[PDB]
Structure 1
Amino acid sequence: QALLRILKETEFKKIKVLGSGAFGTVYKGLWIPEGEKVKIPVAIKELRANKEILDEAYVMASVDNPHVCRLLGICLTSTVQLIMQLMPFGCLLDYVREHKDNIGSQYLLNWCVQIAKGMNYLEDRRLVHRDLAARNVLVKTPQHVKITDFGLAKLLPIKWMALESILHRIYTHQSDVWSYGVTVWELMTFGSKPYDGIPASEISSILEKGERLPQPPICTIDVYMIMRKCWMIDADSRPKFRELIIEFSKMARDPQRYLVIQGDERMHLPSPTDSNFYRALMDEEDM
């Protein structure tokens, strides 16, 4: 395909390590096009059957949405190194932790809109994410986040999975809606760990008995009810992503009534001069 570039070992180098998961290790790298002197920053994930890999990979490189990250290139040899575009701000989970007092309700609600927009695109393409979490939402600019780690799931998180995924390994677009709720909960708690102190082996036990994540202190009841319907036992009773896009888009038009944060009227707001400046330098895709 013309979308997944197959790279040689000799045309890219790992430079600095950025993080790891229980799947692979993410490096900041450099691509040196053959015959050129430039060095282009890329992100590289070295994972811990080659045809199966390439096939799932083509499926990945076929995502064309402003809020979904595209797999750009691959190098199948010693280890499976995956190449995508570098996001200098990092993952959305770390971003809300380092800035846990200077994030206003306009940003948080718009992030919820965009993640749902990206998830809705995955459902239209009939692709199940399987690993949605704040750690797997990247920040391109503060005004533009993107969902990442799409396919790595099958190519290779108890507290984010739905009960039916935990009990029966059933992953559907509605179990992704459960995962979306936990991702939204994480953002409204500024990066708190869900079920902190609870062993992962016991989560399905507490889920069956009716307990859910408690109400974050900044959430009104309108926002918390959306998160609670995402955790209904009946998977067909959970909201659809298209319904979530509409609901968070409404609340983003009056952020102060649905989120109570201290100084929200003193926090930075996306400026047109600022949004145009970010676009010309870091974010030229369509939107």
Structure 2
Amino acid sequence: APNQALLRILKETEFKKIKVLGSGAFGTVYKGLWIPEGEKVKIPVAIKELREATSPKANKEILDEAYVMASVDNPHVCRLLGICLTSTVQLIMQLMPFGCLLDYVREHKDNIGSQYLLNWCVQIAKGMNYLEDRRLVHRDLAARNVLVKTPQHVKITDFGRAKLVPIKWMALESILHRIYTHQSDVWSYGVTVWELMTFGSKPYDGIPASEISSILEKGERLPQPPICTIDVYMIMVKCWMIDADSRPKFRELIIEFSKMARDPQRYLVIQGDEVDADEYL
């Protein structure tokens, strides 16, 4: 029907960049402070200035992404706050205090519980299902791209493609033919999960990126994280089937983990197991 989600346009002077968050091949990120004009309030944010090259073809393109971060309302996907109109469009968004899901697990890894890990998997599967339900391919899904609002709430948030290269996290169809379907995302999901279960291991460490396409024919994949039971590692493997049709659908993944979420210690073995923008409104 009508799709009335506001796009709010902010002027740059209202907010400044503090420290750099990460770098992508085209464009970068900052964590900064938004200070509405004369409102005595400093809102924590995240800003993305475009890849500096700015030619026009890319601008009609960067904007379609802003359209999207702006048009989805779901508990599991970040929601875009503002955008800026520099010559090279910038995008604004609420900052998530606990950082990338990838960082959070490295810093409080001695403390993460089995109950906590499954809840994140079930949540992400929902966030990805919402988009697959909305017919949309993320194409870039992986640990450094899910966020932590509170250890109890996570949200997907990079859309660099959001088409409606990260090879280690891409399906075989992708590497060889640049074919992304909803099921090509599932392959990424499978590696994203392996990421949590190692609290931050680099998938395929030290394997030159070019030998990767050949490794997968040869039939090798990522190994079994320690704290994983075989019931969990099996779902990771199924997502890596060379046949895109053999992979689980994001709808079914929500369900499978919801089962394990009921009984976390039966599937995960851990030693010693046991101002806000959002506020703004």
For normalisation by structure 2, the TM-score amounts to 0.89
The 1:286–1:125 alpha-carbon spacing in structure 2 relative to 1, beyond 3 Å, is farther
Tell me, in whole angstroms, the C-alpha distance in 2 between the residues paired with 1:56 and 1:88. 23
User: Which range is displaced more, 70-79 or 169-178?
Assistant: 70-79
User: Which range is displaced more, 178-187 or 36-45?
Assistant: 36-45
Tell me, in whole angstroms, the C-alpha distance in 1 between the residues paired with 2:33 and 2:144. 23
The 1:244–1:38 alpha-carbon spacing in structure 2 relative to 1, beyond 3 Å, is same
Deviation string, structure 1 residues 79-105 (Cα, Å, up to 9, x no partner): 332100011110011111112221111
Deviation string, structure 1 residues 220-241 (Cα, Å, up to 9, x no partner): 1110110000000110110011
CA contact 1:230–1:239 (8 Å) conserved in 2: yes
Listed as ranges, the gaps of 5+ residues in structure 2 are: 52-57
Q: Name the SS of the counterpart of 1:159 in structure 2.
A: coil
Tell me, in whole angstroms, the C-alpha distance in 2 between the residues paired with 1:38 and 1:99. 30
Total equivalences in the alignment? 269
Deviation string, structure 1 residues 186-226 (Cα, Å, up to 9, x no partner): 10111100010101111110001100111111111110110
CA contact 2:31–2:44 (8 Å) conserved in 1: yes
Tell me, in whole angstroms, the C-alpha distance in 2 between the residues paired with 1:253 and 1:227. 19
Tell me, in whole angstroms, the C-alpha distance in 2 between the residues paired with 1:200 and 1:155. 27
2:261 matched residue in structure 1:
252
Give every structure 1 segment of 4 or more consecutive aligned residues whose post-TM-superposition deviation is greater than 4 Å: 151-156, 284-287
The 1:153–1:243 alpha-carbon spacing in structure 2 relative to 1, beyond 3 Å, is closer
CA contact 1:23–1:156 (8 Å) conserved in 2: no
Tell me, in whole angstroms, the C-alpha distance in 2 between the residues paired with 1:139 and 1:234. 33
Q: 1:35 Cα deviation (Å)?
A: 4.5
For normalisation by structure 1, the TM-score amounts to 0.88
Deviation string, structure 1 residues 42-70 (Cα, Å, up to 9, x no partner): 11112224333323321221111101011
Greater percentage in helix: 1
Tell me, in whole angstroms, the C-alpha distance in 2 between the residues paired with 1:34 and 1:216. 50
CA contact 1:67–1:145 (8 Å) conserved in 2: yes
Q: CA RMSD in A?
A: 2.3
CA contact 1:5–1:72 (8 Å) conserved in 2: yes
Q: Name the SS of the counterpart of 1:58 in structure 2.
A: helix
Q: 1:156 Cα deviation (Å)?
A: 11
CA contact 2:137–2:164 (8 Å) conserved in 1: no
CA contact 2:136–2:162 (8 Å) conserved in 1: no
Identity, % of aligned pairs?
A: 98
Q: 1:12 Cα deviation (Å)?
A: 1.9
Tell me, in whole angstroms, the C-alpha distance in 2 between the residues paired with 1:35 and 1:85. 19
1:285 matched residue in structure 2:
279
Deviation string, structure 1 residues 123-151 (Cα, Å, up to 9, x no partner): 01111011111000111101111111124
Q: 1:2 Cα deviation (Å)?
A: 4.5
Tell me, in whole angstroms, the C-alpha distance in 2 between the residues paired with 1:125 and 1:37. 39
Tell me, in whole angstroms, the C-alpha distance in 2 between the residues paired with 1:104 and 1:9. 42
Tell me, in whole angstroms, the C-alpha distance in 1 between the residues paired with 2:161 and 2:221. 28
Q: Name the SS of the counterpart of 2:66 in structure 1.
A: helix
Q: 1:11 Cα deviation (Å)?
A: 2.0
Tell me, in whole angstroms, the C-alpha distance in 1 between the residues paired with 2:103 and 2:69. 25
CA contact 2:138–2:161 (8 Å) conserved in 1: no
